[PDB]
Symmetry: C2
Subunit: 548 residues, 2 copies
């Protein structure tokens, strides 16, 4: 092979006492090592399995640890070799955390790329537009299941987006804006997509046998106690509400400043809405500053398990997304357009608004940022050791933003899904090229779900049936506030019924890899079972005596 059978490579930063304990702990478990020179201040330890008699023991111990928790190619061997380095010494072997405690001089451990499979996949998918189900299994036998779930989800979202893009173009030549047919169909689409993906997840976790790995909770190495009381965390978790209430006011001031400068320009053609465009093209910069504060606040709260840090980070990213993406449109649909006679004499300092202003705001906030934003072995190992590290959490955030724009403010302008579909099609195979050229290879982490991002998509539908049903009343064709509060009531309690009726009609249809596992488990059980198989009573002793 082009790699020299190297399973992993460990980078050790620099004295010669922390190196011998590393080599001893790697040689205690069965691993063969080889030491070479790093870049300029480090050493490289290449690690593979020592013999064929120890790889079988490692595979058997990992299967025992899987079977004891209810869970029971290249990406299986790399997984059972990675569990021989980092799993603690009582359970598995050598317990090497990367750099937190007693291992501060280890920088990172990482596997090596295989350029032949990456070249023979990026060529055969350069013009295909839709990956087959035998193509998703090659983004699983390399990179594991945590990457395959993400790629399958993005392809299913692109396949479902073609219906609002083709229905909102026909609801723009024939019906216009603020329609009831488009609002009802768009609200049903958001229910059907989520309830369809929730069973595609069970299908895909029955196909790739990772059915119950969500309950095996890992433990963070950056936890600092060991026990930490659950009330000292519930007081550090209250620094989120002044952060949210301060960010909301700091954005409302900027949006009111744009509303004042547009009035001052309009008093003294298309250059009137320049202070809105220059704010709408600058939100991905001012939303990447609040995420660093959210990350510092999430690291301050001192979580113990790894599957709680991710839920806290997702919940903190959702609030920043809401504040910086949907508050500039909520503040001009419910506060500024229906109250434009008690606000405009206040915002017109140095004294000198139809519902089309809302349509122009939706156009400028879902288009502008997209238009603006468009020997030989030891050398390549040193090149691969200097690349960045990949994550899927920066590409599902943009998907959640797009889904919120579809669920909330789509009746205002029905060419929002066409504008999202064109942008999704231009950069289709761009995150694959990112993951096998300009990043380093991730260890084959297993997964069961795309994560807690599926719980933020169900919130944004419930809000949408309120918001998109208070616009169709307010701006189609005197507001008459009781009819608005009756429309909101009946729309929300009809959403809650249609979601129940859709959720229980998709539970009867079984996908083809759940039926195969059900038949196999039934056959195993019914094959195991058939291999297994005082003077009152002395009156009728025998069978034929009782019948006589």
């Amino acid at each position: 092979q082009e790699n020299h059978h190297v399973d992993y490579v460990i980078r050790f930063n620099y004295a010669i006492k922390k190196f011998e304990v590393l080599l001893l702990e790697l040689s205690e478990v069965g691993l063969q090592t080889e030491v070479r020179q790093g870049d300029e201040n480090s050493l490289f330890v290449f690690v593979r399995a020592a013999s064929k008699k120890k790889l079988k023991r490692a595979v058997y111990q990992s299967r025992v640890r899987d079977w004891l928790y209810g869970v029971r190619s290249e990406a299986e061997r790399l997984l059972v070799i990675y569990h021989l380095i980092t799993v603690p010494k009582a359970e598995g072997g050598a317990g090497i955390t990367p750099r937190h405690g007693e291992w501060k001089n280890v920088d990172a451990i990482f596997p090596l790329h295989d350029e032949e499979t990456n070249r023979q996949c990026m060529r055969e998918w350069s013009k295909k537009t839709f990956l087959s189900t035998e193509d998703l299994d090659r983004i699983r036998n390399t990179f594991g299941e945590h990457v395959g779930f993400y790629f399958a989800f993005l392809q299913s979202y692109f396949r479902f987006l073609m219906f609002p893009a083709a229905f909102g173009f026909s609801c723009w030549l024939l019906l216009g804006s603020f329609s009831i047919i488009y609002t009802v169909v768009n609200c049903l689409w958001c229910i059907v997509f989520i309830e369809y993906w929730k069973r595609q997840e069970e299908d895909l976790s029955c196909r790739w046998q990772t059915k119950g790995v969500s309950a095996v909770h890992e433990k963070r190495a950056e936890f600092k106690p060991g026990v930490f009381p659950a009330t000292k965390r519930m007081y550090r978790q209250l620094l989120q509400v002044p952060f949210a209430l301060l960010a909301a006011v700091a954005l409302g001031a900027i949006i009111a400043t744009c509303f004042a400068i547009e009035i001052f320009i309009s008093e003294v053609g298309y250059l009137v809405f320049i202070p809105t465009i220059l704010v709408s093209a600058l939100i991905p910069t001012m939303s990447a500053v609040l995420l660093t504060v959210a990350t510092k606040l999430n690291d301050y709260e001192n979580y113990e398990t790894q599957d709680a840090y991710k839920v806290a980070l997702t919940q903190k990213i959702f609030v920043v997304n809401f504040i910086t993406s949907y508050l500039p449109i909520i503040l001009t649909a419910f506060v500024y357009v229906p109250f434009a006679s008690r606000i405009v004499p206040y915002l017109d300092v140095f004294h000198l608004i139809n519902p089309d202003r809302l349509r122009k705001q939706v156009i400028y906030f879902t288009v502008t940022a997209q238009i603006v934003g468009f020997a030989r072995f030891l050398t390549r190992v040193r090149n691969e050791a200097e690349l960045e590290d990949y994550d899927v959490t920066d590409d599902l955030r943009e998907m959640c933003i797009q889904f919120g724009y579809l669920a909330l403010f789509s009746p205002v302008w029905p060419l929002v899904p066409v504008s999202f579909l064109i942008n999704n099609w231009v950069e289709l195979r761009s995150d694959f090229f990112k993951i096998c050229v300009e990043c380093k290879r991730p260890w084959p982490q297993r997964a069961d779900t795309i994560g807690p991002w599926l719980d933020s998509l169900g919130f944004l539908s419930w809000v949408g049936s309120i918001t998109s049903s208070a616009l169709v009343y307010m701006f189609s064709n005197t507001i008459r506030c009781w009819a608005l509060l009756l429309t909101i009531f009946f729309s929300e309690h009809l959403y809650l019924i249609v979601r129940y009726a859709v959720r229980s009609a998709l539970a009867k249809l079984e996908p083809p890899n759940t039926r195969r596992e059900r038949i196999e488990r039934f056959m195993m059980r019914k094959r195991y079972l058939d291999t297994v198989l005082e003077r009152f009573w002395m009156r009728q002793r025998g069978w034929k005596e009782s019948a006589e």
Copy 2:
């Protein structure tokens, strides 16, 4: 023993050909039989285990069938003997359905009472007022777990009812009717009781090892195909909406007739509201006629499994309970009192209403029906074979009615919980005396939950936060309809948040029999695990060569 080691007794109604196949199928599996004369047209077949070598085989086969589905005293032996008679011939033995197909001449099979334990329990509990946790385990080692769950639930409900009874008496000497403090506290009590019982169920199913028996689905013998298409059932399931819409109109006509006769009596002291009292004391009679129609409609829909017939019957009983119990008070709180100037000149035929009429309606509907409604072996076997059969589904229906009155209409009159607590205390040990004197003994059926009745109690809280927050606005101190529809919105969406905050604070507190099973499973796993445990690479062959 006083019983002659009789495990079961089978009643066979009458020619002599259907008897020999019964005795042969009972003797194929290992069971000793003895035949005696029945009452006047039947025979009695007494059945016990044949030897000590076959009871062990039956216990082992029942444990194998439990372990293959994830589940793994007197009430264990009776359970494994009952599974040797009715379980189909491919899995267990002899497949005797009581009377549906090929066994039409078998009337019933039933075990015998033990009068010594029933006498020594009904005496030691005749003055105790609260059963200990070593007393619920004697209503489990006899009668099984399906009866013990019911008795534990009723005792927990009686223990929680003492707080609204003591708080609504203090909100009647000091604050009166239609209060905000009483409405908020009463709405929080209904959340805390349900979320507390939902973890007491997990505690009790970890104590009595029946943790996962809800997934083992049984099969109805009255199913008539074998397959039945799932769309011929979904058209028979649409005969429920004309039944409901006809029962509602047939009750609204009667309530309007009472409203007319009260006006006609009042025109021409306490005898004015006689046509309401005589309707409020007659609802348990006219609600036992609609349940027979609901039972016929539920048997017409042809369900296959036993755990779907029960959910359909509970859902059909809930609608009849709603229509006949809360519609006479909804029709006089939202239709008749605020519109008493456009209705009273219509209901006053032969021409000749404060908010205290609503208080009198709640008084007459939660009090009146309660005040108005207050040798030697072969002889006792023939006496026990003529008693009725017991069920727990006629005593949880009255509990669900009482909980709906507490959740919905309690701010109108705060002596509703005192009136329920007095009635619950007068007849405390009355369903135990019913189950061991005037019924026959049930076979020890296992259980995991009280059933789908816990899903009707969560609906009645969600409705209550609407209803009990539209009365406090409407009748305390011009209705001003936008303020009513704003009160309903904020009350419902505050209920949905407080229920989430209570549900996730009770998940951290673990009851003492869940921790013991967690520690035991952890110790078993950590006891099983510790018993288990090319010129590039030939440069540094060995451990100490790499460190040098």
